[PDB]
Structures are given as C-alpha cells and as structure tokens.
Amino acid sequence: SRRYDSRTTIFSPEGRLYQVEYAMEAIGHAGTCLGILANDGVLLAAERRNIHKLLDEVFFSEKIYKLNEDMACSVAGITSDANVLTNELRLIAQRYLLQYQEPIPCEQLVTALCDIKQAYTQFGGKRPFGVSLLYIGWDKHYGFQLYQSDPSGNYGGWKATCIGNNSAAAVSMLKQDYKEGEMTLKSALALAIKVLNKTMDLSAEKVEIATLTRENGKTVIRVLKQKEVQLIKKHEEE
Amino acid sequence: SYDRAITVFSPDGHLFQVEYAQEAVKKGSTAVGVRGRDIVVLGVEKKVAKLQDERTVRKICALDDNVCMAFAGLTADARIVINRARVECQSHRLTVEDPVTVEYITRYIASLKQRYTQSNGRRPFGISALIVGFDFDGTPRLYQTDPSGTYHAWKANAIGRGAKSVREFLEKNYTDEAIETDDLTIKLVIKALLEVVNIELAVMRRDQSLKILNPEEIEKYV
C-alpha cells in the first residue's frame, strides 16, 4: 500500500538520503568508540553503556567482536543491527578463506559489508542499519590497518578516528596529539585514555580496550584485563 | 519484494528523482577532465583530515588496463557502478577478445544508470562519471555520464561542486596552446581546480597505463 509506505530509499529535493542521516543521528547518541593505529599494532577503545551494577558480564567483551584470526571490530549505534552485521562479516571472511585458502585482506572485508549496507539505501524499501563500525586488522598487503564504515556504505582508512558520542571533540584531540608514523602501542594507549577522559561524562569498569599485535608471524587479539586498564593511573600523573 | 515506482513523471515532464540525484552530484567534490593531444588528465578535489589514510579514499579508479574514471556524488553508489563496470570489461575481453573501447564501457555505465531511472523498487544512482582512455588507433577519449544515463564526449569537462564555474573557465582556457605539451595539459587541470578550491591528480598516456602523481610532484605545480 502506497499510503503506509514511508519510502526509505528515495532522494530528498536536495539529493539527501534522510534515513541514512537519521541513522547517523542515532550513532551520535551511542557509546564513544575510537581506534588508533601504531607502528607495532592497532587498538580499539570503547565506552561501556552497560554500566549497571546488577549486570552479569558473561562474555570476554561487550562491544568488541572478533571477525577472524587477523581482525576485530567495534560498533556504535543499534546493538541488534550490529549483531546482524558482525555475523555477516564472519561469514564473508570464512567464504573468502574457503575460496582462496588465505585470510581476507582487511579492506576486502569492509568493502563486502558496505555493499550490503549500500543496497539497503537504494532498493528493498527497508530501513538501513543504524551502525557505524571500526575495524582493526593485519594483512600481508598493508600490515596494520584501521577502517570506519557508516550506514550509507561509505568507508575510509584512518590512522586514528572516533565514532559515537562526542566524536567531534575526540577527532579534535587526535589531530593535536597523534604523531603520524611515530606512535607505539604504549603511547597510543596513553592517548586513548586521554581522549576518553575528556569525551566521557573515568573508571576501568566504564571502558573496554582491545589490542591487535603480531607475535611469531601470528596475530594476537586480546581484551585488556581490568588490572591493566594501571593505564588510567599512569595518565592522572600527567 | 519491493515494487514501488520510485522514479515517476511530474506535471512538466520532470523526473524529480533523477533531478534530485543530480543534486547529490553537486554535493560531491569537484572533478576535472582534460583530453590532450597524446594524454588524458583527471584531477579531483580532496575533502581531507590529516589522520586519514590517503590510499583508501580515492576518487580516481581504474576500470581496465586502458580505461579509468573519476566520479562526483554518493561515494557508495560510485563503488557499485565501478565494480559493475569492472566485471563488464572482463566479460567483453572474454567474448570479443579485444579490450573495451572507452565509448563501449561509457555506453554500458550510462545504460545501467538509465535502468535505475525506470525500474521498480530502486532509486537512481547519485553520481556523475568522467571516463578517460585511448582507443586502438591511439585516439584520446573523455566521456561524461550522469544519473539520467545521458553520455557525451568532451574535450574538457568538470563535475561536482562548482562544476558550472570550472566549465566556464575551461571554455575560455581550452585552446591548442594549453594542450600543446603534457606539462601544460596537467597545469590546465590544476588551474581549473584552483578556481573553486588538497588535490589528487592522475595521468594516462598512450598504452602506458594509469600513473598517479606524487604529492611532491603536485606541490611543484602549485
């Protein structure tokens, strides 16, 4: 029925996609999430929106998802939509490995998912996914990498970026502090705490940090324990 | 599945969804193409952060060994059109055993765009494209496609934000003297861009494939 159809996949008179823009509004109200590239690894730092005292915490992470052996990601927006998309990312990665018997290069994984998101903006008359994702990974082509995708299916590579709440304020701090080509993981960690310190309105229970490194020709993805997240104490001295 | 007629006629013979698609093009970064004597040059505005990886966000892309294009508008829509064209270039090599002519692939891209203006359940593509390369006899070529699926060949052209101003500059500046050498052909593109503008530039020569210029080499011209 033409009466009830909200027409989610049309252009506005200015050549805008309203559903995409309203989806990006949703993301701006989601937990802060940032990623930083260094010379010896990549990291993701996320604000936990959980926060409640009576929560159980059954998983190893809440906002950081492993995608394959060499890749993880984090999300900002509708949680349920993120679950659909991250499942799909795992499927694409496995489909590539089946076919080529090598891991999917990071950009190829991002492009494949963005094609799905783009499709939702052009046909099918459905609402788009209200998710921005940060992807971290290593491949044999470009080494350590960081990507960001948004609801329209646009993506870009970054040395450092932020999505979610107060991301504009975060991107400002990154431009000032990020030493291009001179960042280690230890200094990147420091900068992450420093950025989350300003944008978040800090506790170890309120943040989640994952690092991606190479050890003996093999990728290691680990979520830092509460004790390691010592990093908050190291900043307050500065 | 979804079968709503999205692109329809309005009372004056207007196709509003196509016109709105053309507005999406105008929100895009400026792209300039100049056809020289024995060279074709593409140049694009880059708006970019310092923290961004330059390699990932490029508005100049190779379709085949002998064909490349630049775009303005929705970047996601562009990726879809580019990959469709890339598949088609291979299907042509398969069936005819020759590389695509610049005109053939243009015609293909244009008809794809046209179909999305007359198909149920779909909105038009919100990009214009500049398509460059050489034919078998070594003739340089520059074509433009737009959301309606119209295509034409140009000596020089611009698309995206402030395309009208750049076009009027090129009209007064596109002479024999300006395209007499390869250095002056590149210069004319940079001048055209500096009229509305941090710039990315690529050159294609006769049977020599696409070469993207370094930031240090672009800084010399500016």
Binding site: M24, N154 | K47, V57, T75
Partner: peptide, 5 residues
C-alpha cells in the same frame, strides 16, 4: 556531508 565526494 560525510557520504559524498
């Protein structure tokens, strides 16, 4: 906007 260029 962020999704053009």
């Amino acid at each position: 906007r962020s999704y053009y260029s």
